[PDB]
Amino acid sequence: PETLEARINRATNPLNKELDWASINGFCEQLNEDFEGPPLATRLLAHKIQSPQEWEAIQALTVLETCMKSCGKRFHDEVGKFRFLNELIKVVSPKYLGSRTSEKVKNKILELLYSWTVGLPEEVKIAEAYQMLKKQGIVK
């Protein structure tokens, strides 16, 4: 089948007129079966989420959201590592990309993080990262 990259470029393609739920699903599926899967997938979303093109970032976030909802224990491991949390922080923090980032994209990320501190207490690093955004005042 198509590689993870090909799957993500379609799932987050700036030309999509609507969410490509098909290709998206295919993404969460494929990544959760390769040993190198999660780390790769995780690195790709990070880049997509930081795109200057909002629609490309919004879809990426939707993909991240989706794969996190499946019983993908492996995906939660990668997303739970600061190796990935830092990338989301760079997008919402003013000290980095936070300034040039759309309000829409930043608010979505904050909500995504919250929801995980709730349905995924098992992941402390997420709560840890989320907590820092609180102190900085990012979390109004």
Partner: peptide, 7 residues
């Protein structure tokens, strides 16, 4: 292994 929390 994992990097530290960004500042």
């Amino acid at each position: 292994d994992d990097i530290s929390l960004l500042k």
